Structures are given as C-alpha cells and as structure tokens.
Amino acid sequence: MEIRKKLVVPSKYGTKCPYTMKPKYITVHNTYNDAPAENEVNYMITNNNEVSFHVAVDDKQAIQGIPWERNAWACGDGNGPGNRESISVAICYSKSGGDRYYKAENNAVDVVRQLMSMYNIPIENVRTHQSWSGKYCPHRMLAEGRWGAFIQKVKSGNV
C-alpha cells in the first residue's frame, strides 16, 4: 500500500530524530490507543517530547512521520541498536482491538515487507519492541500470541 508522507519539520530533528541511520532492523509496536494513524502521527510531530516512531498504520492507511534513515526514539533502549538501527512501525487501534485493529495489523504486514525490500532487511531482523528493552509491546500481539503468524505472513505470504 502507498505510505503517506507527513514528516516532522527539519527544525525539530534535534528532538525527534537527531541522528542519521542505516536501517538494519524493523521494530513492530502497538500504540495501545484507539486513534487513527493521522492523529497518532500528527501528535508525534507536534509535541516537544523526545518520543517518536517512523510510521503509523491503521485499518485504512500508513503515514510516515520520520525519514526512514534517521533514528526515532521508540524502543526505549537509549542509543542501543533498537533506537539507533531499527525503523519503528506502530499499529493503531490496539487498545480496544476489534476489526479496526486486525485490519491495521494486516496493513502493517504490507509496510514491513516494503521496508524489508527497500533496505534489504532480513526476516530475522524484524523485531518486537519488547526484544530491545523488555517493555510489553506490541501488547495485543503478545497477549493474543499473534507474532509468529504475523512473521510468517511477512516472510512468505503473497499479500
């Protein structure tokens, strides 16, 4: 699917994405919220907190807020490989789940595949936020045990 652009202004780089990056991993997240990707992104590029992610994906679209080759602060691991080498994808509507979320998860499969192809990132380098810092994210994918299936679709699904 087409990944919509809505990057943060270069003037906030020092706050949202100060460092350049050579993508080597893709980190999947759940927002633990029920807001659309546009809202999630818009908020992330407007507030002045050192919190960010590359792309938000909901049941309808994918919107990019941080240049792919600049780091984001979403893996909570300081300057570890999480925040300094991975591209973060945030799946919307996970708080309450429902068709909206499962639809957004399917779109996220698309996004991860494009990113893997785009930066030549292998399937084994597709990770959960939890693998980097220990935080329970993506909470819904973890609690429902959907990670394994998500991975196989990205890996060999014809979607």
Residues 30-49 that bind a second copy (CB under 8 A): 32
Q: Is 85 left (phi over 0), alpha (psi -120 to 50) or beta?
A: alpha
Buried b or exposed e, range 109-130, using 16+ CB within 10 angstroms: bbbbbebbeebebeeebbbbbb
Our finding on whether 137 is near Zn ion (CB under 5 A) is yes
114 vs 131, beta carbon nearer a second copy: 131
> Is residue 52 within 8 Å of 74, Cβ to Cβ?
yes
Q: Which of 55, 73, 130, 141 binds a second copy (CB under 8 A)?
A: 130
- The partner in contact with residue 136, picked from Zn ion, a second copy, none with C-beta cut-offs of 5 to 8 angstroms by kind, is a second copy
- Binding flag, residue 19, a second copy (CB under 8 A): no
Identity of residue 1: M
The answer to whether 54 is annotated as binding is no
Q: How far is the CB of 158 from Zn ion (least distance, A)?
A: 28
Which residue in 20, 47, 79, 152 binds a second copy (CB under 8 A)?
A: 79
26 binds Zn ion per the rule CB under 5 A: no
CB 90 within 8 A of CB 33: no
